[PDB]
């Protein structure tokens, strides 16, 4: 069940200076990078272009190049319209893409956040605010909905291009998405808290438990998943024990890559 995400972040410091950067994720793997500095979208994977011809890609990027410039001016001209109600710094974030399903089914989203709160979305054929949004957004929404040219484009982007493009992506990138990478684990302790360190595994699903023989220690706390640079994960479980109980404790690690060879690590 893969989720394709085009994340855009834009900052407007004052009336003049502004910048826009973007990344693109398929599941948890970055496929693209678009720095404000660059005039072109970067592939961060040999199969980033999915299954579009050279001519389809170049046309796609040209649409984006134009959008990025237009988005900048348009925001700046919305501040002008809304003022003195709203003012710089302004931070806009876009989250757009589609989620792919069994068979040939999908769902597309285009979500906008302003100063960190989700406020606007494309839905159906128009822009609309969401529950919780300030009422003043109604004018920007009305101005944006006046532009039929953008509406139909965006409808085409979400309805057809995303699902189509991404399908191409999952074909071309099967060996990376289906990569298996074994974890590695090491024990350690702190004033007493014992720590099982699991690092280098892919994909993300993983099972880690502290155990006295067979009894799974109910006090195990899993930490968050932290990323490594090389597109693998890192996680740790802590068990709180009273000093002198460390004898005969073990860490058991399960992960698809190990192929039923659970990692066993005794204290």
């Amino acid at each position, epitope marked *: 069940n893969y989720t394709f995400r085009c994340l855009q972040m834009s900052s407007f410091a004052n009336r003049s200076w502004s910048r826009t950067d973007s990344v693109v994720w398929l599941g948890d793997l970055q496929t693209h990078r678009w720095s404000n500095d660059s005039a072109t979208i970067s592939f961060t994977k040999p199969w980033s272009q999915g299954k579009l011809s050279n001519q389809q890609w170049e046309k796609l990027q040209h649409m984006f190049q134009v959008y990025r410039v*237009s988005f900048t001016r*348009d925001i700046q001209e*919305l501040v002008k319209m809304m*003022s003195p109600k709203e003012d710089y710094p302004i931070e806009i974030q876009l989250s757009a893409g589609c989620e792919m399903y069994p068979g040939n089914a999908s769902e597309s989203f285009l979500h906008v956040a302003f100063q960190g709160k989700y406020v606007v979305r494309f839905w159906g054929t128009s822009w609309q605010t969401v529950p919780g949004a300030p009422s003043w957004l109604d004018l920007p929404i009305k*101005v944006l909905n*006046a532009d039929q040219g953008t509406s139909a484009t965006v409808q085409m982007l979400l309805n057809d291009t995303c699902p189509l493009f991404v399908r191409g992506l999952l074909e071309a990138g099967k060996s990376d998405l289906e990569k298996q990478e074994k974890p590695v684990a090491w024990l350690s302790s702190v004033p007493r808290q014992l720590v099982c360190h699991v690092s280098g595994f892919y994909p993300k699903p993983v099972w880690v438990m502290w155990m006295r023989g067979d009894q799974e220690q109910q006090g195990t706390h899993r930490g968050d998943f932290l990323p490594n640079a090389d597109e693998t994960w890192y996680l740790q479980a802590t068990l709180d024990v009273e000093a002198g109980e460390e004898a005969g404790l073990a860490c058991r690690v399960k992960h698809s890559s190990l192929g039923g060879q659970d990692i066993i690590l005794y204290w």
Partner: T-cell receptor, first 111, second 113 residues
């Protein structure tokens, strides 16, 4: 959707203050002032998005806008100059693209 | 200078046809509009072309737009004396009031009675 300008024609002297005014009855948030000089297309001087707001256009120097009300947009020449001689156009619109243009105003500035 | 018109000026006899060019580099190019401006008067809109490849007509006036070529023409059929005027090309970079208009300098048409 009609838009008027006053005066339609004005002779003025260097140093003098001149005001050009635009009345628009269609309830339009947005108004614009242009100047047309032979051999150039119209150029944007100032614009406005609503009562109280005024905005710098492409060639704003020497000019000051005033949007007191939804109906009025004035272009003020605080110190008229030979070079401010031109035909001056005003326009309004809503949130759609079309702008509705005034009939124009010939200004002459003599030394 | 992103909107250029051609010819600068032309003289035609009443009844003959003529074609006016407009080439631009505005980006993006939502729509293109043709104005007619009598000497002294102001701007009367003749047509507005909106599609990638668009064609329009309005009386004896007709007009094409090729967005790919970023090029437009205004055809006047059977010119009359009242056609004597300046023809202005205008490109609009948005489909909403967020856009700016980009005016060409015009093409001067004189029609011999």
């Amino acid at each position: 959707a009609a838009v008027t300008q006053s005066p339609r024609n004005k002779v003025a002297v260097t140093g003098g203050k001149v005001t050009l005014s635009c009345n628009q009855t269609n309830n339009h948030n947005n108004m614009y002032w242009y100047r047309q000089d032979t051999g150039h297309g119209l150029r944007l001087i100032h614009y406005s998005y609503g009562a109280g707001s005024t905005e710098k256009g492409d060639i704003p120097d020497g000019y000051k806008a005033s949007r007191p009300s939804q109906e009025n947009f004035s272009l003020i020449l605080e110190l008229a100059t030979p070079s401010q001689t031109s035909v001056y156009f005003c326009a309004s619109g809503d949130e759609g693209y079309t702008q509705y243009f005034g009939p124009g105003t010939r200004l002459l500035v003599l030394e | 200078t992103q909107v250029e018109q051609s010819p600068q000026s032309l003289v035609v006899r009443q009844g003959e046809n003529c074609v006016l060019q407009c080439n631009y580099s505005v980006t993006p190019d939502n729509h293109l509009r043709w104005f007619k401006q009598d000497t002294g008067k102001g701007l009367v809109s003749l047509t507005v072309l909106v599609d990638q490849k668009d064609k329009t007509s309005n009386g004896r006036y007709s007009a094409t737009l090729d967005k790919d070529a970023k090029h437009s023409t205004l055809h006047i059929t059977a010119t009359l004396l009242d056609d004597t005027a300046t023809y202005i090309c205008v490109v609009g970079d948005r489909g909403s009031a967020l856009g700016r208009l980009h005016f060409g300098a015009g093409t001067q048409l004189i029609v011999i009675p």
